[PDB]
Write a protein that binds this ligand. Structure first.
Ligand SMILES: Nc1ncnc2c1ncn2[C@H]1C[C@H](O)[C@@H](COP(=O)(O)O)O1
Ligand SMILES: Nc1ncnc2c1ncn2[C@H]1C[C@H](O)[C@@H](COP(=O)(O)O)O1
Ligand SMILES: Nc1ncnc2c1ncn2[C@H]1C[C@H](O)[C@@H](COP(=O)(O)O)O1
Lengths: 520, 520, 122, 184, 30
């Protein structure tokens, strides 16, 4: 693709249409790119004795990058509703990436006024980490994605990565990556950038909730043919009746004693919190009493753990200590914001396959009972994996992460990103972008010294992203209507998912995905 | 293959050459074979009340067997260096086995002098357990493999196996295996034995170390868009301020509090030991305080457990109670040898995926905190498997095991041999070998009694083993040099991996495999 | 960070034409690539002046340059049994990483790197 | 790369200071021309690469070469008051050529400065061209040579023009990337 | 070359003859 100055290098493709078996979303946004790090690679690390479990070492690059790992980058609210309310599941298929209508602007502070002018001969550099040789910094819920609202212009994030570290120091096996050591396409105004990607085979997401329960699985009307022991001593308690071994045949009556075929999913107990700031202990325990793990003598918070339900029946006020994902409302400090300023996600559809996050797991025996010894019971707060266990995964939300790169290790278990979504061995590659350095006035005499005098300039253009989604259609013989997402028909102030009096788009609530029901 | 007496039945093929995409190692050694068990199958078992957790029952056969399940059987030190320093990974592909240049010698003690002479008409029997009908006794780190040094002659190990047992007694379901009930090729001098094998699809080994860490995975420069709860009470602590629910948005600052996508590998805590024999408790606890398991009321030591790191940063002196593999120096008693006589292996490259062996795992909650109850924290010392967990496997060393047969059971998890290496459903089969019994002078009168008078004789010949290895090539955009294995250029006494003044080959140190670095 | 090649002086005699600073001595080395901004005269007089022109518009140029070189390798073929000495970085806990930019973005090469690590016989 | 205007577009005769030094007496000229240099190994090999080469090969040598100049921008600057404004001169050109017949004094291979930065992210200034002739002290001889680079055919480039060049090295022995395990 | 026990695997070639333009020397030893 090569055209002229007064000729656009692309069009605005922002649309979505459905094919009953699949859906194609196209999304275009306007982007702006500054000059990060002053065209310099800078070594970064932790403050000399500021914190210990936060010690780190890495580098900062003059490169920006494109991100669209959020669902609202592609699905308008209305669309998300069509998807959510009609499909057993869904997944990604293809991807088309396009950069175009590029403009390079250089600015000058002459006196007390900034003039901005065109630098037509200036270039910009783009490339894609398709061999995954660069540290994958996406799928970490960072900021700088495409604006949920198409009319919103966004700033392109800067690229930085972390390496291996011993405290604030580094090791010998630490890796330094130069992005100038990658072949990249240079673009002038009227040039453009093309890219296509094909997702791998990754299971459909669960856009459903089970209409049955792991324990309420059998026939309510018939008794089993298996027997269990329910009386160890209790007999005809009158004369000469100390103890006896008695067995009962399973019945719809003994519903939680019947022989079973499957187990609930794994668990890692979280601490229970209440939204009412007075049910809780008068202490500050978000760290000393929260669940966590430690690698190399460094404690890390187990924020979203295994998929566990948020609360039990008849509660809805108790949420796991960070046992779920939380989104911040529009306009809310990054530092200690009120509970009325955030949006907490309820995972109450998986109550049927998964243990509750705050509750125990079950009961294990740990002794050899006899006439001499009384049988001991121990509450299990942590459960690894077991043959027979089944479970559901974390939901995805309109503004949640989509995919995540699966770490290249010797072993994985259930490679589904813990924050939710699609785990990929080879995910959509990283798209790097940066303004090419333009030297200012050079000396008539030759100076070997590092060149530091540059013309200040930023870039702007459009970006387009087209993704094809495969849908799993609903096939239910449920007679009664199912629950659907819907807006309040009530006379309301502002309209949900809209701009306000002074033009600011805002998403009212987090949107789940499990509205339709399937059987176990 | 059939030739004469004065004609060699094979040549000396000991070489190795590289094809950039693969490497072929050929190895030849001289072997000697006695007459084990006096041509008798003997029932063996445990000493009448000698030990309990060591009770066993099995049999002893007159058969020898070939073993080359050690890496140094194939790779010269120099070669191992070429492999180690250049390849993301590697694996086995093909195998060619050859026995030849066989000589059967019979010896006689006439007076006080032993004369040894040729028995040309005598034979030897070879076969291969290709249907795996015989108990697989390899992959247990036994002795009797091919000498690391090609010039070294070795003695062929004797074959024995264990069955099912109740103490020193046996059960009804115990199996007796006669190797004479297998079709075997009989060889005279000038005969030879041929065999070819093809390995199965088994993942490349990790010849790399991660340049990132499970917890240092995100962008150091950008903040997340997710929120966590970090203050439960601590507020504007002045007037009327008991408690409040406050949420902070993840930042490069709150680096160990940010939402996460993956977990570290499983763990089974080992006891911590120091090399300095005075940091430790003045007790003898290698059994009463070490990690172990028990099958059928029999305690067995969990020697090499799940892959866990040996020590944390800034230590290198603390090694897990048998939480790693240990090799004995050349010439060192099999019974209680000094610490300066053994070589302990450091697993400090997997610090980034795996928990430390001696340290805890993490923190789990186990109560329902409220104003009435203070939040309780429990240290988890044992962790099963969890969805989202990723890990690395144990390293392989120049003198370590190569493969191991995967037990034919209903279930496996991660079928990688715990001592390290390649786990195979159908591994290189066992090659049995034994001298055919030659009766001595028989009586002119017929005796039904079992024949017991035999001519004493042993056998000797060469053995050749050719293996083809597939290599995974290095593809890194790391700018700075990586760490490589190298010899000390320093003025030294003896040369590393060499024979000494009186001709004795000795390997100085255990050699790992993870020198090159890859990203997560 | 050493020199690569050097032009061999066009004389009647040479001995061992290897550049003394090291590297490859070439009769016909990569040629010199000259570059310069073309002079742009400033305002000229309405009257004709023969005098040498000296009034120019001050200006500089900038662009990219690319250089692609193909190297032939002589492969290692040794029957040395023991490991040879290799170049490697210090695995030790270190301050700054070797051959890297620092706190204020300045690339620096720690040590001079030789070439003779592998061993051959005479 | 960035290129200033050397010598103010002038060829200047240079020589030694009137009685400053004797074994350092010299005579030559200074040209308004710059030049490209990449006679350093770190111009091509990243450290990691150098390591791969060093640790695995009995020897090595050069074979081919491809040279390219592109994405050219000519900027003209003005000091109006106390502030320097820099603007595009689109119609301005630049001149390139290559001494392929070796008619110009070869000033490379003398370990001079101005090569390509070891680090790819580093921008560099292009060196100025100067040469030395034959001299008797601070004076010159009759057999001294004056070289004008304007007397060479050169390609003129505007913005959007580019420069191409390919070269093939001669047969030169592999370097010794080894050390002898024996002694004479 | 592969023969038996009671069969020599070679002969004694110790001679030299001249070709005016070249000379061939053969030498055998125990
Ligand atoms: N997001 C995602 N990506 C890939 N696989 C997933 C995912 N979620 C669940 N699984 C399941 C599907 C396969 O049966 C299994 C493969 O594990 P393996 O470790 O590959 O043998 O993991
Ligand atoms: N050494 C070895 N052999 C075989 N498989 C390995 C090994 N190491 C890791 N794995 C992994 C590779 C497969 O994804 C998985 C198959 O488990 P399965 O239980 O076969 O379904 O186990
Ligand atoms: N760098 C370099 N270039 C060229 N020749 C080299 C070099 N280094 C060693 N030699 C040797 C190779 C030839 O045998 C000899 C030719 O010398 P002559 O004077 O050409 O007959 O010089």
């Amino acid at each position: 693709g090569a055209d002229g100055v007064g000729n656009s290098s692309g069009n605005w493709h922002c649309d979505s249409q459905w094919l009953g078996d699949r859906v194609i979303t196209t999304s275009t946004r306007t982007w702006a790119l500054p000059t990060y790090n002053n065209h310099l690679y800078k070594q970064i690390s932790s403050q000399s004795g500021a914190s210990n479990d936060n010690h780190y070492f890495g580098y900062s690059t003059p490169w920006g990058y494109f991100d669209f790992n959020r669902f609202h980058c592609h699905f308008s609210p209305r669309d998300w509703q069509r998807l959510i309310n009609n499909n057993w599941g869904f997944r990604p298929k293809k991807l088309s990436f396009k950069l175009f209508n590029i403009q390079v602007k250089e600015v000058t502070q002459n006196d007390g006024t900034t003039t901005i002018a065109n630098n037509l001969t200036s270039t910009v550099q783009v490339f894609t980490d398709s061999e995954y040789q660069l540290p994958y910094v996406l799928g970490s819920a960072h900021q700088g994605c495409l604006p949920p609202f198409p009319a919103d212009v966004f700033m392109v994030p800067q690229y930085g990565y972390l390496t291996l570290n011993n405290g604030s120091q580094a090791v010998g096996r630490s890796s330094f990556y130069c992005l100038e050591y990658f072949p990249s396409q240079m673009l002038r105004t009227g040039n453009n950038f093309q890219f296509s990607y094909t997702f791998e085979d990754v299971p459909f997401h669960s856009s459903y909730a089970h209409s049955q329960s792991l324990d309420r699985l059998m026939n309510p009307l018939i008794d089993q043919y298996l027997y269990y022991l329910n009386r160890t001593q209790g007999t005809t308690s009158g004369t000469t009746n100390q103890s006896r071994l008695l067995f009962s045949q399973a019945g719809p009556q003994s519903m939680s004693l019947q022989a079973r075929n499957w187990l609930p999913g794994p668990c890692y107990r979280q601490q229970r919190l209440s939204k009412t700031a007075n049910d809780n202990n008068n202490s500050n325990f978000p760290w000393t009493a929260a669940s966590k793990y430690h690698l190399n003598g460094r404690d890390s918070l187990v924020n979203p753990g295994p998929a566990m339900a948020s609360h039990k029946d008849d509660e809805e006020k108790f949420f796991p200590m960070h046992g779920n994902l939380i989104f911040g409302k529009e306009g809310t400090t990054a530092s200690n914001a009120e509970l009325d300023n955030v949006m907490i996600t309820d995972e109450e559809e998986i109550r049927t396959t998964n243990p509750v996050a705050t509750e125990q797991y079950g009961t294990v025996a740990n002794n050899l009972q006899s006439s001499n010894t009384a049988p001991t019971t121990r509450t299990v707060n942590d459960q690894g994996a077991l043959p027979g266990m089944v479970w559901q995964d974390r939901d995805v939300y309109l503004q949640g992460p989509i995919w995540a790169k699966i770490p290249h290790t010797d072993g994985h278990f259930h490679p589904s990103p813990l924050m939710g979504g699609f785990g990929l061995k080879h995910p959509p590659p990283q798209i790097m972008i940066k303004n090419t350095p333009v030297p200012a006035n050079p000396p008539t005499t030759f100076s070997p010294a590092k060149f530091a005098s540059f013309i200040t300039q930023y870039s702007t253009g459009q970006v387009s992203v087209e993704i094809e989604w495969e849908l799993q259609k609903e096939n239910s013989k449920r007679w009664n209507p199912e629950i659907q997402y819907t807006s309040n028909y009530n006379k309301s102030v502002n309209v949900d998912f809209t701009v306000d009096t002074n033009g600011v788009y805002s998403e009212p609530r987090p949107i789940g995905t499990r509205y339709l029901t399937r059987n176990l």
